[PDB]
């Protein structure tokens, strides 16, 4: 019984984790109701990982919906699985933090933090042990990014033994609310690089890319963005959900994927990606799981060196031909690999695929090619930064000039890292 | 394709090899250290064979069998064939031989001046030289030694030499030893002749390396270019003068040599049932004396080739070898046993 | 080839064949490692929450 | 009569101790409730087979093992298994959560907690024997538990029990079974702190077992399954003498006098044949001198090297099944006119031969055929330390860089223990090359 907390925080946030949820409910089994019909036990056995089990044979999800406007919790309480959530869970203001990080930091988000915390102890006093807690948010925005980032801190404050892994959803000009956005993720990104042991960098460019030029979408919205987030998050659990012997449970994956402690930022990637009824062969899985067009960061990684490599293969296949696909690649393709962590590549099979595949792949790479997606948000950072254009939303939260200097200058140091470690 | 490394920067045959791999645009080159491999051609000294053959999906092979140091070293060599019954202390295509340590440091000095006692020119020769001495004082010989391990032969007073010029030879054979341990005999040979007529009665007339004919001899490339006699004239020379061929008289003792030398150690350095593979070029040394009997001075595990057989048989290296492993998408003779 | 020390029973027999002659810690010191490793994860502990306050 | 008391350490430990202890049951006709017909003395006794299993006075004979996990997922098969009925709730003890493949996560902060409960589950069983010889431990290397706690639970035996020998069965870490990159680093750790502490340890690479398993048996991706079985095989030929009438390595002190002349150099070399895959319906049964002359290749080995670059210390043949004297010596006079088989001079170049009559058992149902005959080398080789430079070279790497090194300093680990266990094995590898090459 290793048991996680999932957290879910403004409006991308709550969209993406009630996709989420929803999708891993069909995966096991549980209904909207939260009544159980599946018909395989494989379904159970890790299921309380993310769900607490109630009266009536009653599954609810182990998550807490955190916003500081009511408007998309009340979608998502009148979306699809809207009624399994646990309504004390619910926990949302009123005034909303108008994509400002520094009201979801340290004016709006301050006043709402601690009823969160309270919600968060009653889930952990109910753990036989908890392993740790996974956040959804978004970079860009005020709630997930400013309160998010409040809400890790506090948490690493009263539970500093435990994993913190974040879905953290990267702005993007190309798919923008506001100018603001990269003030806001610059500023939680440092947060992230001091408080979090895994972040998986979900680039909206990427997703927008992807439904673009991949999947023929002309118009992409944000559902169709979510839908590569909700398959990408599926997979990337699967070793958490499903029974297996390789990174199982979230500091397992830590000391696996993390060879210095601030290099901990992940390029998640899929497979396959159709615009649909044709079978996908291993060879084609595996080809397609490490091609840049598969990857949800926007980042080349022939642009730099890859730490650390976990692939995770779904459904009925032939891993012996699995090992052999995944030892191609990296003996096709040595010089992406560093040298000086011998067999960085761990491979995992789990039998049950995702809905309507046969067969899929989840990429999860700890690439230095992840310093250009840092590098293309401090860009945009500075360039209104030195004409200190749009600052005055945040000296009016009571936050100086310097603490957005040293948020430069920390992710400057980011990016300066993985550059030491790409030559 | 296919992956390979380089670790001996200063092999002349393997350059040329590693430049033929990447010309077929089927085998990339790999940073030295990279494990994922699929050709290693090695260093000299100290080749981690532990670390070979432990890589999931790779089918690895080295140029250099584990353990051949034994037939190419001087006292390694005299000991394998005193001590090895294939060979024996009878053998007779190689010179009486012993292993003589320094009196700073088993050994064979009381035995080597036993035979002495009983034509009394000896060599002094190591293998840390470019250091030899020819003498028929056996006090000279140890004194010699005294000023690492040294062997000490029978010096062959009685060369072939050859005419016009009265001057020594040695013939040099390549042989290519393949994963499945096929023993492959180069049908191009060299003989590094000596500039100078034989004085049996100074080394440059005795000593015929390359490199001591070009710097101590003032007759260099005066008979032949760069004193290196290749099989073709040395054929002739044989009709006309001594009326036989090359293959009679010469090459059936040396490559009976090269099957007794190789077949003896087989058990100890083949890949066969190996997680890794094995292959290696060997450099066989001859001397003929005037009775056009053969004798094995010494055995080279990193020879160098003639510029005008490079190019050929670094190809034949690429087809035997390593195609034989690795297919992409004869000018040997095998020796078969 | 000599065979030496013979022993037969019931469920088999051993011997040896012969074909060449020849030619901590205390309990106390491993408490005081254990003690100084937690009071090093106490001390990094106490810097975060030092770190956090702040 | 002694009695040995088997101590089954993380994952690896476990499950391969669950594999041995139903061998075990199979060798010795126990059923899985624990009884025992053959045993005409009910309650008690001194057989030979006593010295692995205790006597209840409902006739149960039950096995004298610790089965430890800081995870209780891995021995909760062993509560809910076949053999349950064997086991009594104070010999399996589990944790909440792992090492997390963090050798100074189950060394120091886990191990703290939890290593006074398992020396008492230990104590208990100690005091009923009337004359213990000893331990075995069963982990890998590459587990933060298996490497972590084993390491310190053999410090702690090593001072509760300094008369007793103990013997380790240790899983050498394969990138092609593996679940973690840091494995070099826990196996390299683990081995400096237990090596003072162990005086015979059997090596097992997973590299040779799986390969075994795929040449051998047919098995494309072998499981943990079918390297367990196979694992249990070459430990029972071990322990065999422990649990059988005989005179060969008949107490734990006799594996040190026979194998080990130098306490460091405690690693010997296992070699096992024949290997026969059972969905053969019919296969050639192999003669003595067949299944001898096969423990000198390198493919049936539980280490892959060469022992033709090394030098022997010492050498045990362990037979088992239709096998006489005679056999034996013909076959070895052959080998030696073929192989290249060189001691040091320093020791006699022979062969300490065990035979037992009684024939390998297969689990039913396995992927093992049913033998004739069969035997396992044990020989104390210098080329064994091949597997040692790979391993040092592979934490050299990842060391120069510092990678992943936060995760032990964070656990109130040092790092001049990286180096310092490092140390030890540059001095272990240079002991081998004296020993070993001229
Ligand atoms: N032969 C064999 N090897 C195993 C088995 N289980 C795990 N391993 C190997 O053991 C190594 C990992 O160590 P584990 O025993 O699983 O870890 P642990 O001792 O439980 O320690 P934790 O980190 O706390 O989980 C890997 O190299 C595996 O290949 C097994 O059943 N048989
Ligand atoms: N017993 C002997 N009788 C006559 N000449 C001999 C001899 N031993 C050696 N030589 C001469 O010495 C020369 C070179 O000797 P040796 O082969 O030991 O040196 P070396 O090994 O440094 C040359 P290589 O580059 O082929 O290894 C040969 O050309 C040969 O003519
Ligand atoms: N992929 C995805 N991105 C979103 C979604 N909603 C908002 N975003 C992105 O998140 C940022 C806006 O933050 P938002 O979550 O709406 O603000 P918040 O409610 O204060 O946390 C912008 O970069 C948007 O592009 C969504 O549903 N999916
Ligand atoms: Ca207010
Ligand atoms: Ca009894
Ligand atoms: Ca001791
Ligand atoms: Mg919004
Ligand atoms: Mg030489
Ligand atoms: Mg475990």
């Known amino acids: ?423 | 394709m296919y992956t390979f490394v380089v670790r001996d920067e200063n092999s002349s045959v393997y350059a040329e090899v590693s430049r033929l791999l990447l010309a077929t645009g089927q085998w990339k080159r790999l940073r030295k250290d990279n494990p994922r491999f699929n050709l290693m051609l090695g260093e000299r000294n100290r080749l981690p064979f532990g670390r070979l053959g432990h890589e999931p999906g790779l089918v690895q092979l080295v140029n250099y069998y584990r353990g051949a140091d034994k037939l190419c070293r001087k006292a390694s060599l005299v000991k394998l064939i005193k001590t090895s019954p294939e060979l024996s202390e009878s053998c007779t295509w190689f010179p009486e031989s012993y292993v003589i340590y320094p009196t700073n440091l088993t050994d064979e000095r009381e035995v080597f001046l036993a035979a002495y006692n009983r034509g009394n020119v000896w060599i002094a020769k190591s293998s840390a030289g470019a250091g030899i001495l020819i003498s028929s004082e056996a006090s000279e010989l140890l004194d010699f030694i005294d000023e690492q391990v040294h062997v000490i032969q029978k010096y062959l007073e009685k060369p072939l030499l050859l005419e016009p010029g009265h001057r020594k030879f040695d013939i040099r054979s390549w042989v290519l030893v393949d994963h499945l341990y096929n023993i492959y005999l180069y049908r191009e040979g060299v003989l590094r002749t000596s500039s100078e007529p034989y004085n049996s009665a100074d080394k440059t007339c005795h000593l015929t390396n390359h490199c001591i004919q070009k710097e101590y001899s003032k007759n260099y490339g005066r008979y032949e270019e760069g004193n290196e006699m290749f099989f073709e004239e040395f054929n002739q020379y044989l009709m006309d003068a001594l009326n036989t061929t090359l293959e009679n008289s010469i090459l059936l003792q040396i490559k009976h040599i090269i099957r007794s030398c190789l077949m003896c150690i087989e058990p100890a350095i083949s890949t066969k049932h190996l997680h890794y593979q094995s292959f290696q070029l060997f450099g066989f040394d001859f001397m003929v004396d005037e009775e056009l009997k053969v004798w094995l001075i010494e055995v080279n595990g990193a020879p160098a080739c003639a510029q005008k057989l490079y190019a050929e048989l670094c190809q034949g290296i690429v087809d035997v070898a390593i195609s034989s492993v690795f297919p992409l998408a004869s000018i040997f003779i095998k020796l078969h046993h | 080839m000599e065979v030496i020390e013979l022993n037969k029973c019931t469920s088999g027999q051993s011997f040896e064949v012969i074909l060449k002659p020849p030619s901590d810690p205390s309990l106390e010191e491993i408490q005081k490692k254990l003690e100084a490793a937690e009071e090093r994860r106490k001390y990094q502990e106490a810097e975060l929450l030092k770190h956090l306050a702040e | 009569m002694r009695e040995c008391i088997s101590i089954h350490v993380g994952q690896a430990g476990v499950q391969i101790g669950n594999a041995c202890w139903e061998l075990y049951c199979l060798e010795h006709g126990i059923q899985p409730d624990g009884q025992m017909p053959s045993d005409k003395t009910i309650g008690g006794g001194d057989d030979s087979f006593n010295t692995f299993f205790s006597e209840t006075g409902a006739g149960k004979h039950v096995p004298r093992a610790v089965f430890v996990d800081l995870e209780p997922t891995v021995i909760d098969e062993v509560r809910t298994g076949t053999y349950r009925q064997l086991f009594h709730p104070e010999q399996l003890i589990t944790g909440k959560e792992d090492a997390a493949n963090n050798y100074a996560r189950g060394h120091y902060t886990i191990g703290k907690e939890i290593i006074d409960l398992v020396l008492d589950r230990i104590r208990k069983l100690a005091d009923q024997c009337t004359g213990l010889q000893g331990f075995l431990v069963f982990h890998s290397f590459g587990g933060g538990t298996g490497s972590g706690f084993t390491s310190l639970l053999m410090e702690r035996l090593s001072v509760d029990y300094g008369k007793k020998s103990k013997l380790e069965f240790s899983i050498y870490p394969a990138p092609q079974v593996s679940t973690a990159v840091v494995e070099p680093y826990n196996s390299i750790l683990t081995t400096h702190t237990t090596l003072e502490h162990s005086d015979c340890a059997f090596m097992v690479d997973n590299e040779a077992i799986y390969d075994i398993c795929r040449r051998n048996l047919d098995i494309e991706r072998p499981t943990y399954t079918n390297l367990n079985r196979l694992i249990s095989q070459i430990v029972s030929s071990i322990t065999a003498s422990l649990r059988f009438d005989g005179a060969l390595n008949v107490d734990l002190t006799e594996f040190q006098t026979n194998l080990v002349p130098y306490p460091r150099i405690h690693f010997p070399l296992a070699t096992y044949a024949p290997v026969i895959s059972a969905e053969k319906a019919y296969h050639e049964q192999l003669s003595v001198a067949e299944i001898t002359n096969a423990c000198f290749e390198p493919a049936n080995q539980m280490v892959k090297c060469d022992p033709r670059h090394g030098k022997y210390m010492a050498c045990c043949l362990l037979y088992r099944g239709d096998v006489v004297p005679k056999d034996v010596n013909a076959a070895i006079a052959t080998i030696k006119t073929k192989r290249s088989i060189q001691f040091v001079d320093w020791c006699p170049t022979g062969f300490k031969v065990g035979i037992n009559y009684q024939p390998p058992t297969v689990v039913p149902g396995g992927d093992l055929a049913k033998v004739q005959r069969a035997v396992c080398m044990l020989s104390n080789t210098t080329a064994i330390a091949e597997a040692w430079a790979r391993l040092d070279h592979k934490f050299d790497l990842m060391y120069a860089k510092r990678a992943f090194v936060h995760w032990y300093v964070g656990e109130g680990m040092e790092e001049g223990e990286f180096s310092e266990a490092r140390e030890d094995m540059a001095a272990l590898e240079k002991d081998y090359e004296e020993v070993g090459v001229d």
């Not at chain 1, 890859?306 to 995770?312: E, H, M, Q, R, S």
């Not at chain 1, 990429?363 to 945009?380: D, H, P, V, Y």
């Open chain 1, 1 to 423: 019984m290793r048991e996680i907390v999932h957290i879910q925080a403004g409006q991308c946030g709550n969209q993406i984790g009630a996709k989420f949820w929803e999708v891993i409910s069909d995966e096991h089994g549980i209904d909207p109701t939260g009544s159980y019909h599946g018909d395989s036990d494989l379904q159970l056995e890790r299921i309380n990982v993310y769900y607490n089990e109630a009266t009536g044979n009653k599954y609810v999800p182990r998550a807490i919906l955190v916003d500081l406007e009511p408007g998309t919790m009340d979608s998502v309480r009148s979306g699809p699985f809207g009624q399994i959530f646990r309504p004390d869970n619910f926990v949302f203001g009123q005034s909303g933090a108008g994509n400002n990080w520094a009201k979801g930091h340290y004016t709006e988000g301050a006043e709402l933090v601690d009823s969160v915390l309270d919600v968060v102890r009653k889930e952990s006093e109910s753990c036989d042990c908890l392993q740790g807690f996974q956040l959804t948010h978004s970079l860009g925005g005020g709630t997930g990014s400013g309160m998010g980032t409040l809400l890790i801190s506090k948490i690493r404050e009263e539970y500093p033994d435990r994993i913190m892994n974040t879905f953290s959803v990267m702005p993007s000009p190309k798919v923008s609310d506001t100018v603001v956005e990269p003030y806001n993720a610059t500023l939680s990104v440092h947060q992230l690089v001091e408080n979090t042991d895994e972040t998986y960098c979900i680039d909206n460019e990427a997703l927008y890319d992807i439904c673009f030029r991949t999947l023929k979408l002309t118009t992409p919205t944000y559902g169709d963005l979510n839908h590569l987030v909700s398959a990408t998050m599926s997979g990337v659990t699967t070793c958490l959900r499903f029974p297996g012997q390789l990174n199982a449970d979230l500091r397992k994956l830590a000391v696996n994927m993390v060879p210095f402690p601030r290099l901990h930022f992940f390029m998640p990637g899929f497979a396959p990606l159709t615009s649909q009824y044709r079978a996908l062969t291993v060879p084609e899985l595996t080809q397609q799981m490490f091609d840049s067009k598969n990857m949800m960061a926007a980042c080349d990684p022939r642009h730099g060196r890859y730490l650390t490599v976990a692939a995770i293969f779904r459904g009925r296949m032939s891993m012996k031909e699995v090992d052999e696909q995944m030892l191609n690649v990296q003996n096709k393709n040595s010089s992406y690999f560093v040298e000086w962590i011998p067999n960085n590549v761990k491979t995992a099979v789990c039998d049950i695929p995702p809905r309507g595949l046969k067969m899929s792949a989840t990429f999860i790479g700890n690439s230095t090619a992840i310093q250009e997606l840092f590098k293309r948000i401090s860009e945009q950072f500075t360039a209104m930064f030195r004409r200190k254009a749009f600052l005055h939303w945040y000296t009016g939260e009571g936050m100086d000039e310097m603490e957005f200097t040293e948020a430069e200058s920390n992710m400057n140091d980011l990016v300066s890292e993985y550059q030491q470690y790409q030559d």
